Write a protein that binds this ligand. Structure first.
Ligand SMILES: [Mg+2]
Length: 225
């Protein structure tokens, strides 16, 4: 069963190819996760130069299999149950009064490493909106990711609203619609409605001159007693 693959520390690789309003970029990440504690740590580098969008707008795209599912909820952990063959994770991220990201990712094991490979496409961004104008603060709020089963697709859906702080004290909403479907043909766990409680801390490596993001993430399943 997939959950057995997560009882210890697992190395993580993340690779993203993006195009936002014609601005092409790539991000590479490395770190590790320990789902026992709902915890993952990564450092991401923009390998093409300067990132053309704010780092916070990429956090959700850049491994929910590292969520801590409490023992009494283990039967609701789709994410691990699809491993090692993995899952496709797709989103539409709608930035209020601005453009949208469409993302397609494959999350799977490559040997003993958990890999998140992503294509991101962003369109219809305003040239001096909060995203292409870089008006988002380098910080991140705590959210609830609401998950529901999609039995027709043998997977799940999720819906949630990310709140991005703007440098003038306002908030940029980013509505997330998500679908995950298994890559393999083995059975998966189809959960009851629940949510993941998320927390994120963004920082910088004081010795790093490349455009980059250091991330500490907690994800904890909740909403079933
Ligand atoms: Mg503020």
């Amino acid at each position: 069963k997939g959950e057995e693959l997560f009882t210890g520390v697992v190395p993580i690789l993340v690779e993203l190819d993006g195009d936002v309003n014609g601005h092409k970029f790539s991000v590479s990440g490395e770190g590790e996760g320990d789902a026992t504690y709902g915890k993952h740590t990564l450092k991401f580098i923009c390998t093409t130069g300067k990132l053309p969008v704010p780092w916070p707008t990429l956090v959700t795209t850049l491994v929910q299999c590292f969520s801590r599912y409490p023992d009494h909820m283990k039967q609701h952990d789709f994410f691990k149950s699809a491993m090692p063959e993995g899952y496709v994770q797709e989103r539409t991220i709608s930035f209020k009064d601005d453009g949208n990201y469409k993302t397609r990712a494959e999350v799977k094991f490559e040997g003993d490493t958990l890999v998140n490979r992503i294509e991101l496409k962003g369109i219809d961004f305003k040239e001096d909106g909060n995203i292409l104008g870089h008006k988002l603060e380098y910080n991140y709020n705590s959210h609830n990711v609401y998950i529901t089963a999609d039995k027709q697709k043998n997977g799940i859906k999720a819906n949630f609203k990310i709140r991005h702080n703007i440098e003038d004290g306002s908030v940029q909403l980013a509505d997330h619609y998500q679908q995950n479907t298994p890559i393999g043909d083995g059975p998966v766990l189809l959960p009851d409605n629940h949510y993941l409680s998320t927390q994120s801390a963004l920082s910088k490596d004081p010795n790093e001159k490349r455009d980059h993001m250091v991330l500490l993430e907690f994800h904890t399943a909740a909403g079933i007693t």
